[PDB]
Amino acid sequence: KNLGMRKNGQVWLPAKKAFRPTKGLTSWELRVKKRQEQAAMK
Amino acid sequence: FSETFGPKAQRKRPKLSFNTVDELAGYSEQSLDSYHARLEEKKLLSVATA
Amino acid sequence: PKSKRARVYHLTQVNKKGREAKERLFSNIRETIPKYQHCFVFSVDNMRNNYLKDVRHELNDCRIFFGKTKLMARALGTTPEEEQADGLHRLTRYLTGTVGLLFTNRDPADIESYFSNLSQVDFARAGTVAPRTVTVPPGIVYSTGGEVPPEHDVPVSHTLEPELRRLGMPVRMIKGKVCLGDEKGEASEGYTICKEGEVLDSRQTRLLKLFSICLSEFKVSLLGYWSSASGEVTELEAGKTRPKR
Amino acid sequence: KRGAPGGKLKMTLGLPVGAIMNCADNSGARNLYIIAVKGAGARLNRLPAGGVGDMVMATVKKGKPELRKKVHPAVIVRQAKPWKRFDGVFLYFEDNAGVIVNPKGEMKGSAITGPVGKEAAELWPRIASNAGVVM
Amino acid sequence: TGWKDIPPVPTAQEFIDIVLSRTQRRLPTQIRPGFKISRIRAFYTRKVKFTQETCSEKFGAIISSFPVLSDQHPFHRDLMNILYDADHFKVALGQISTAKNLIETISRDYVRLLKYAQSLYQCKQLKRAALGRMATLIKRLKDPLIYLDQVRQHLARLPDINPTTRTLLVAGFPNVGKSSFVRSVTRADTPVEPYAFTTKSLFVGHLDYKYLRYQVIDTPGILDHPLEEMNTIEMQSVTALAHLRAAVLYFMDISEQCGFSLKAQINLFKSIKPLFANKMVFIVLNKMDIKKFEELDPEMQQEIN
Amino acid sequence: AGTINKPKKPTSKRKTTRLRAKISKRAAEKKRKERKLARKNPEWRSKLKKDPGIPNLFPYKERLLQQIEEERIRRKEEL
Amino acid sequence: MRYIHSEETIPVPENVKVSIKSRLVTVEGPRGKLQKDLSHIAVNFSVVKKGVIGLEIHHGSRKDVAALRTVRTIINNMIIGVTKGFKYKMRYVYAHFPINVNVEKNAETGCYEVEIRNFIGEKIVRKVVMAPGVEVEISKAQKDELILSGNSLEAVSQSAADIQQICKVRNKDIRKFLDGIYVSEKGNIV
Amino acid sequence: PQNEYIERHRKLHGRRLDAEERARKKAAREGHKNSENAQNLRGLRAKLYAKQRHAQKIQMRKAIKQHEERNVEPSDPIPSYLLDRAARFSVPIPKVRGISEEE
Amino acid sequence: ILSVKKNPSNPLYTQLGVLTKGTIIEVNVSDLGIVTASGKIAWGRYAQITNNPENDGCVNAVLLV
Amino acid sequence: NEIKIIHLRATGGEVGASSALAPKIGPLGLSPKKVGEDIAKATADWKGLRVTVRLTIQNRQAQVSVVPTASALIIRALKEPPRDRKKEKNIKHNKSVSLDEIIEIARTMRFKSFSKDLKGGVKEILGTAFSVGCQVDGKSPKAISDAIEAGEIDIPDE
RNA sequence: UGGAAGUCGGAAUCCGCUAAGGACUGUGUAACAACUCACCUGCCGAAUGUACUAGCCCUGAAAAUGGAUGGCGCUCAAGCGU
Ligand SMILES: Nc1nc2c(ncn2[C@@H]2O[C@H](COP(=O)(O)OP(=O)(O)OP(=O)(O)O)[C@@H](O)[C@H]2O)c(=O)[nH]1
């Protein structure tokens, strides 16, 4: 069952996820490599 | 005015015209006599027409 | 994106720690290692962990770290090419979930005896199974909710009843007193906070904490320990059972 | 309360503003000049008017000098304009006359000379208690 | 018969907003440069006069509704002096009256100038100047308006004590059962709690004896120290003892569970005995279930006798 | 506001010739006045312009910095 | 920016039977049947996996992507309604005059009917007719409690809101006069 | 009633059962209400609201600046007795607008 | 004010004593404690009007010190 | 035979501390005058100082004890002139104590301190003295604390 | 200070245990208590936050007979930019 409380009291509400419509466009490793390159260039 | 009365008030000692119990009794007696004199003066001194 | 949540800026003294706290934890763990022979890993799962300060005070000669699990694992060294001392990457496989490090000069048997006979009764958290059935009786509500006899209990505070109504207890104010139903007790049954053999949620555990009813225990389970002299990790009883990473 | 008698049926209003009527009581006044009628509505160029049982504001033009400087509440008890009651009776008195009362309805005087109207006697209990003839 | 009829006193900014909203919304606001100078002068003179009429009406409503201490009973006057610094009260109301008269003077001067103003721009500048001076005068009253609003609320919540009637006055130390006695004999809601100074202000209840109405006044507790060291909470009770021709009931706790000694209670009674001249005094020994007068030591019994 | 059930007087978009001519003349007079105040304006004005720079999201900014540094070294060697 | 594809997933239990045709969702469960018209939102329905309903929008803006979350929550609430149901427990409290509540079932309309009397001593008799499918009972376990149960969350919550709004004190201090009917608990029947 | 009677009533009886929830919901809707007022108020009310919101934004950002920097003059040097101190004997306003004889 | 010394628009305006912007007036400066090098009280000093009295309802001036 | 422990905050050499006790020690069966006399006798060493007093209640008699506090110990070690409270007020504690006296105050406070070392205890005592406003060796207790943390002053171990 | 325990006031605002916790952000008490916030840890799973700039849009003040992008009417325009 749902183990925590919701503030508004709508206990039937699902565990919602973040509204990220730009998901899946970048892998994690590529972003880390771009972070290192941006830091070096800066 | 904020330190005299209110939520931020810090006043704790009143400003008195008397120091002793006997002085307070005399002050009360004189104030009552003056009050009665003033109401007698006002009493001696349907709506009225314009 | 005009429609956005307004980020509240806190007008308080304490700010976010950041990367500097991580580096401080790395330095402290990497300096604690060459001073103690034994490094224990202990597990405290689904627990309040406010008696850990008392544990730190009692173990004066020991050093206890209770930081982030992955940061402590990186401090000790996950790979054999990264470990500060030999056998520490063997110890890092024990660090998952809510764990902690214990650097000590003492005997492992002494440490095991202390953490075995140590036991304090503590408030239950959400997820634990209720060991018994708790029911606040009808009538005037007291502070313990029927744990002590009602003649030895102060009535509960009048400021708690909106919280009780939020947590689902159908209380009401009668002449400055919090009551279930009537003041003498009628037209209602006792409020069952929890039943035996039932997973507790946070609402029930908050009610039990407000009524000072403790249904759990403070048990620290030692998983294993790395020794500097032998350069090896000895695994204890909970180490086999606990998931490994 | 603004001194408007409630439960009064519609009757012919015979005493407008400016009428001088007799004073039927022994309060010391002998006539009342009407300056206003309590409960009068708003209408362009229409003078406020009152009937039997209506409360008015009056001034004393003849009587004791003590009553000559104040504006007194009055209740009209007799009128000369003919008016109809609910039983189809058209009636009138031989003179226009009223009595001086306080705003709550109790009289300043202690006795009433002559008869009073049924409407005034029903609407103000002190007039009924201080009246000798009711018509 | 109380002071609940005092209209609410807004602050300086709310007062300015109210007055200028009345001027904006209850008068016409379109005037044209192509009209005659007589029409323009009438427009702006009407604006200034309506603004000062609103200010004068509100200031007169503030002044004429607050109690005047020089006309009150000495009990009520000195109770207001205990609660409130009477100097501060009179200074606040005098500053209100001074601002009212300054607004009237400014309006008179600017109407006289608008009689000679020769253009719509000059008329507009004169009207803005008069309204800005009025707004400055109201803004310089930021503190007395808040003070007087707080005064109004507490006066509205003040009890109604009739100074000349059949009245009982309960006095003594804290935690001696004064509020318990008042709850037992009247219908008043005085809080009864074990801690000291539970009652921080005067309460009054009523009862009927032989078909006559009596009023009973519950007072804050009084401690044993000289009158220069008395706080306002205890001075309310001291003023009640001093100025009210009452039947005084001095409550004493023989069991000494109030936290104070019977000797100190006796010294307080002897100290406030000069206030009891021409008053009828009864000493009520409360809490006799715990300890009785017979169980009291004989020296203390001799002192009480 | 009860606009939908009870609309008010419409605001006309049909401008008048008087208003158009007056607005045009006031605009021209304002342009001349701001030119005069610009010529009389004593506020300091930098001769050089603060250049915005190179965007961070340009993927070849590092290679462009390499090119600029190389050309700087080449110019220093030539000079 | 026009997002090429956005999708959401709704898991369906084994007891639940979902039929979608022309954006008209019909959800069948152990407790009953619910029906809803979602034709005002451009959604493509599919079966991406056995027991999973797939919601998708193609070439939609950020608003069209965000509306899929509302559609997902609506269909999920319909599934929860036909599986476990919804229950609103309400409490009516009074200071001096006891409030009298009588619950009947009008048979010709086939709907429950709540009659409220003696609120602040008023002589008027308030009457609220419930939405179809909402069952109202007076709780025997607790004191002065109504229980509203149903399969439609919107119907149950709107009926509870109507009960709460019909008993509202007017021209009085709400700090002093605390009386009324209030929604105490919101949850599931099962 | 006398003294703190509404406070005593709140002590002995409490508040309405939905009071905290409605206060929380109103505080949550306050942002939508503020935006609706900013986009739909008209006229002098709108102008006063905009000026007052501008004042609040200035005060708020000053508060943020102060809490962020809680933990942190003439060109030529002159002594303390020459501080705050400053030929052609010109008046402060050497030229004004001429006034015609009708004015 | 002691006298009107110069109204810049017209000498007739100075003769009539008209208070306009930029008008030099003579004021009594006894309240400022201005004193000469030996102790004589300086009670007359020039000031200049800096506002528009016909538009503001008040005369504002700056001392010529 | 049950145990009651009551902690209270009182001024030394004063009987009126039991004024607030008689609300609660009253129904417990204690004599407020006897309790106040015992409190005064126990706190006669701490004249004019705000001290913490522990009362243990057994079988309707209570015994008094004085729980030491760092602030009271620092104020006592300041050795202020002997003073009456009600007449002059708004005093400041601007005298000086020695770092040695700070060390025995920390040694007295070892049963309350959770620090690993006596140096850690001395630093808490210096922080309390900084809050009081006094001096240590003629300098600011924050400056002595910083110098101790720098290490040029060696606090003895235990 | 009658009472003031972080939260009626004034001034300072340090140390220890730390993973982290202000001589405290609010609620609350007569004072306590209790709750909460700043901060930290456990679950989760990949992109976010702040401030500005440039477009379009709303407000950014209106009177008085019934009326005006010229009128109908126009919404992936019959509006705007190229
Ligand atoms: N056994 C006993 N206890 C009493 C008696 N009267 C009062 N008490 C207790 O003493 C406490 C004193 O509280 P109050 O009755 O308010 O006395 P008080 O505080 O001086 O009254 P106020 O100053 O008006 O607030 C109460 O809490 C009672 O429990 C009594 O007659 N017998």
Ligand SMILES: [Mg+2]
């Ligand atoms: Mg008390």
